[PDB]
């Protein structure tokens, strides 16, 4: 499906949160994903708004995460990169 893309983005979100906050959340699943289109000058960016389930001390819980997919600046021709904009519990 397309889903494989959305699941990678929720996984990334958790992994990056763990890196930033020294945390131990375990990804379970994506509950709900929304996209929007954004532009900066003549560059296309995509913001992903994800709701996901993840365990904190084994207790399954709900989290809202915002993830950019922005174009890549140098050497790799038409590449992207991800970046966790925001990550919060519902």
């Amino acid at each position: 499906e397309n889903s494989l893309e959305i699941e990678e983005l929720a996984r990334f979100a958790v992994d990056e949160h763990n890196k930033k906050e020294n945390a131990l959340l375990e990804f379970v699943r994506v509950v709900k994903a929304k996209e929007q289109m954004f532009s900066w000058l003549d560059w296309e960016e995509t913001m992903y708004y994800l709701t996901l389930e993840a365990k904190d001390g084994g207790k399954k819980k709900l989290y809202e995460a915002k993830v950019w997919v922005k174009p890549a600046l140098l050497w790799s021709p038409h590449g992207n990169f991800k970046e966790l904009q925001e990550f919060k519990p519902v």
Binding site: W40, L41, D42, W43, L73, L74, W75, F81
Partner: protein
């Protein structure tokens, strides 16, 4: 004096820009570049921090070595976003030079910058409607 006239034009251009006006079409171009530059550096901090570190500037460094690292920046398509990146790069080089007490390099980097615009980017700029088109792109 010319210099007091310059102080005055520069003060008024500023006070006009704070209310959304401009002294001239050029002062507009300058303002949009400044603001686009700050935006680029803020939202692409790592990719900018990346590009800066690709040239160690020294008083022996020559144009071609600058030409090469910018020839890199544009090889898979020129766009406005990337022209802003090019300005920002020149800015970081100038700041670096002054951090090491080599202010003599600043005027040399500007000259390189101007050479690279006039030789390699000016065709694409005129073909894409010129700097007025950038000002309108940045406006909405």
């Amino acid at each position: 004096s010319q210099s007091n006239r310059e102080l005055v034009v520069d003060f008024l251009s500023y006070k006009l820009s704070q209310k959304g006006y401009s002294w001239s079409q050029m002062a507009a171009v300058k303002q949009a570049l400044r603001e686009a530059g700050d935006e680029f550096e803020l939202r692409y901090r790592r990719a900018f921090s990346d590009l800066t570190s690709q040239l160690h500037i020294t008083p022996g460094t020559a144009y071609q070595s600058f030409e090469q690292v910018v020839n890199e920046l544009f090889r898979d398509g020129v766009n406005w976003g990337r022209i802003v990146a090019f300005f920002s790069f020149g800015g970081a080089l100038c700041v670096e030079s002054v951090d090491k007490e080599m202010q003599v390099l600043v005027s040399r980097i500007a000259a390189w910058m101007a050479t690279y615009l006039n030789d390699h980017l000016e065709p694409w700029i005129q073909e894409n409607g010129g700097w007025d088109t950038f000002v309108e792109l940045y406006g909405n």
